[PDB]
């Protein structure tokens, strides 16, 4: 779920 690339959650 967590977006590591952008550092968000989607």
Q: How far apart are CA 10 and CA 6, in angstroms?
A: 9
Q: How far apart are CA 10 and CA 3, in angstroms?
A: 6
- For 8, half-sphere exposure in the C-beta direction (CA atoms, 13 angstrom radius) is 2
- For 1, half-sphere exposure in the C-beta direction (CA atoms, 13 angstrom radius) is 1
Q: How many helices (H) and strands (E) does the chain have?
A: 0, 0
Instruction: Pull the structure tokens for residue 1.
Output: 């779920």
Q: How far apart are CA 1 and CA 10, in angstroms?
A: 6
What is the SS3 assignment for 2?
Answer: coil
For tokens 């989607």, the residue is 10
């Amino acid at each position: 779920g967590y977006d590591p690339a952008t550092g968000t959650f989607g």
